[PDB]
Amino acid sequence: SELYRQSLEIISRYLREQATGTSRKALETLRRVGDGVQRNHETAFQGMLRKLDIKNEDDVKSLSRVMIHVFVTNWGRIVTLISFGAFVAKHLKTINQESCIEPLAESITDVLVRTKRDWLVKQRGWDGFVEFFH
Amino acid sequence: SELYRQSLEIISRYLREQATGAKATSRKALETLRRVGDGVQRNHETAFQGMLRKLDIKNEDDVKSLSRVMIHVFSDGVTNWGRIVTLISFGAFVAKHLKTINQESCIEPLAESITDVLVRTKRDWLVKQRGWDGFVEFFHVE
Amino acid sequence: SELYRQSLEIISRYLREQATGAATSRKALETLRRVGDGVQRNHETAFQGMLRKLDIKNEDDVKSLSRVMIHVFSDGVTNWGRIVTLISFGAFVAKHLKTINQESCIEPLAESITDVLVRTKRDWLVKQRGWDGFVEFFHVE
Amino acid sequence: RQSLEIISRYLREQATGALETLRRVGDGVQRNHETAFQGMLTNWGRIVTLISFGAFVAKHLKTINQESCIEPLAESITDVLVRTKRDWLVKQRGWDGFVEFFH
Amino acid sequence: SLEIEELARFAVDEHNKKENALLEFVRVVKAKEQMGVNPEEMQTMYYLTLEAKDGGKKKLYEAKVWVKWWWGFHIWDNFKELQEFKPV
Amino acid sequence: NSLEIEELARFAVDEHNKKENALLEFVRVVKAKEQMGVNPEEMQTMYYLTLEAKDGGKKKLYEAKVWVKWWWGFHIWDNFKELQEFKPV
Amino acid sequence: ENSLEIEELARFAVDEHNKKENALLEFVRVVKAKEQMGVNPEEMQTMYYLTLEAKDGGKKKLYEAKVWVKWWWGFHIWDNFKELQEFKPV
Amino acid sequence: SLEIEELARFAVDEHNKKENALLEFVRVVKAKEQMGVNPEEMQTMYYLTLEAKDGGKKKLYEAKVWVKWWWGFHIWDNFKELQEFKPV
């Protein structure tokens, strides 16, 4: 969909620049909130990641199964999911699995647009995300 | 007062053994606290870590300061034994941190400051709950 | 104090118009008309049971009743649901006082409820931004 | 069987103008559920409230000249009770528990 | 204390019923509660001292009222029983 | 759930009949949707009901939105129920 | 949903048993799940009755676990205490 | 005061990260909250006057901190952002 194209664009772009170091407003919004959410969820994300063996793309595809199962809907919970993505992306970089980063972004985008599409249409998509954190 | 002597004995022994590691109304209250506080500390581990990283506990003035802002949480007008055991569990989490950074001499004052603000603020509620008997009953299995 | 004058205006007007037939103060009263009417319906039996076992013969009994009404908050829980229940009981008692030709006890009842509520819960009321807190609690998502 | 006689006898004397336990608790429960029971046309407290509701219907059946339905109403209420709380009615030692609840 | 005022009123009404007396309840002067052997019982024994007008003269009485609570279908129910009511 | 849903439907018909001066008779619930509170403090549910009712001896369908606000009362959960909308569909 | 929280309580029951009895059971799956909720609105507790399958040295056995959950109104959230009451072979 | 003390500390931490400075947070001397148009927003603007040490000298600063609250998965979560930080 039109939303999916921007979604994967935004989520992939954000997970990339995080791994290294409307769509324009969503990205800036994501830059603002994401690092704050990772910092406070540091011990949370660590604990969750520690109980999830991710040494390959098999585990990345298996991570989306529990991500799409574990999924109240608000931009807070959405930015937390994408933020957890950035945290796993950084991890994948430290263990020489950089090639699993674009697929991780796709898995997260898949889960977001699948389970909560009704809500995003209702929200005016990423224009709404920018408003929630405005 | 009886309520004060009991409250201080329970909260001091709990914070001491939590900071350390190892081991009727007063006895049963401490056994209850050991069951529950360990579970409450695990559930709140992340939130407690968050608060601690943003607070100074460098002297007894900071310990007294912390006790005052810890009791201020009841101002929404709700008091129950769950909220009370969370406060003590935070106390125990702060005690472990005080042992970790070689400030063991702040532990008993923290225990004393928490007892003070709890008994001073919530004496009437505590007596009406039959003191620490109400606490034991609240976490007794149906 | 403004909290007092607001609380008296709201509780007086609601008890009076409940006993008869028919800005922030305007909205608190709007909220009370929505909610009090449903709280009275729901508690009708309980309120009738209480009333049958209490004396409300004079202003001393009205004063005494306001005191035992507020005592309910001693389990350590205060919210706008419990407060609207207290006021709704007030309205129920006001209708009964009209029924037994004691209409002159209705305004004193409103005053005594107001007095005991503001005296006992001033700090909690202020922290809720007063009656704006009440309007918000019963504002539909 | 032993239930049915208690319920039947309690609903009978009620309609006119354990038994001793129901006498004590029943009229109290009817008084303060009068309105809930008017429109209706686990613990011993809820159980005495069902039998209490039996007595209220029994009183109603008398006012509307349908007294011949009172004994069937006792059997009806007794059956639905024992069939539904068979595993629960044995946990409170039968009516020896009912009496303890209100002792 | 609302509950205490209701129990004392019940005490007089119930005493008035069982012994063809016309006592008029005035006030509670002192209330004591001895609560259940264990909390799960939810039974409370009330010792009440109350003022009542007996033929226009104000006498005092010791009422003992047993209350047993239980969870009703959407409300708390109870059973109250006057055990003793004697002048003092 | 369903039993409580039927009573809210009856409640919606009763409130409609009172607020609009009408004599609809509740027949049955067709479908029931619930929006729960966005956070644990809100303690409110929005019920979206489609129901069948008789109007002058002909059955019609109606959409009713019934708001429920709850709170800790005196030893019980207490609530306020309010009809937000009632229109034919 | 229900199935997820019940699964987490079962994992909890195994984790708590493994600590309390110095055992190394591996949770496999929830088999049966019943719950008795509080008799009144003030109790605010649930008792969870689980049957679960765990591996004990690479052989799959069944267990009965009783997990107690006491909840209360915390600071702007519902909060709870979970406790393993019973854990026996079936 | 608990959320206020953590917000002032965060303001000092956030300021001196954004402006490459080494202020030591000492205390909040005054706290004002400008809460959002409607409470459904759940966004609060905190105005804080705070003491911080700069080159081991005690100075005072006005900090504006925006806080958007939302219901997280098992916890109340928020996004804090320093909007302004200047000496007074």
Numbering used by the authors:
A (entry chain D): 172 to 192, 205 to 254, 258 to 320
B (entry chain B): 172 to 194, 204 to 322
C (entry chain A): 172 to 193, 204 to 322
D (entry chain C): 176 to 192, 209 to 232, 259 to 320
E (entry chain G), H (entry chain H): 4 to 91
F (entry chain E): 3 to 91
G (entry chain F): 2 to 91
Can you quote the paper on this entry?
Pro‐apoptotic (or executioner) proteins such as BAK and BAX activate apoptosis through pore formation in the mitochondrial membrane; anti‐apoptotic proteins including BCL‐2, MCL‐1 and BCL‐xL, sequester pro‐apoptotic members to prevent cell death; and a group of regulatory proteins which bind to other BCL‐2 members (including BIM, BID, BAD, NOXA and PUMA), mediate initiation of apoptosis. In all cases binding between BCL‐2 family members occurs through the BH3 homology domain of one protein, which forms an α‐helix upon binding and docks into a complementary cleft on its partner. We have used phage display to isolate Affimer reagents (non‐antibody‐binding proteins based on a conserved scaffold) to identify ligands for MCL‐1, BCL‐xL, BCL‐2, BAK and BAX, then used multiple biophysical characterisation methods to probe the interactions. Co‐crystal structures reveal an unprecedented mode of molecular recognition; where a BH3 helix is normally bound, flexible loops from the Affimer dock into the BH3 binding cleft.
Similarly, the Affimers selected for MCL‐1 binding were shown to act as low μM inhibitors of their target interaction (MCL‐1‐AF1 IC50=2.1±0.2 μM; MCL‐1‐AF11 IC50=3.2±0.4 μM) but did not inhibit BCL‐xL /BAK,, demonstrating selectivity. Similarly, when comparing the structures of MCL‐1 bound to peptide versus Affimer we observe that the variable loops of the Affimer are inserted into the BH3 binding groove and that a desirable conformation is selected. In this case, the region where the protein conformation is affected is remote from the BH3 cleft, but again reflects a small molecule bound conformation. When BIM BH3 is bound, MCL‐1 adopts a nonhelical conformation at the QRN motif around Arg222. By contrast, when bound to Mule BH3 or a range of small molecules, the QRN motif is helical. Critically, when the QRN motif is helical, then ubiquitin can be added at this motif, and this promotes cellular degradation by the proteasome. Interestingly, our structure shows that MCL‐1‐AF11 also selects the desired helical, ubiquitylatable, conformation, again demonstrating that an Affimer can be isolated that selects a specific desired conformation. The helical QRN motif can be ubiquitylated; BH3 ligands that promote this conformation offer both orthosteric inhibition of BH3 binding and degradation by the proteasome to potentiate the removal of MCL‐1 function in cells. The Affimer again selects a conformation of a target protein to promote a desired functional outcome.
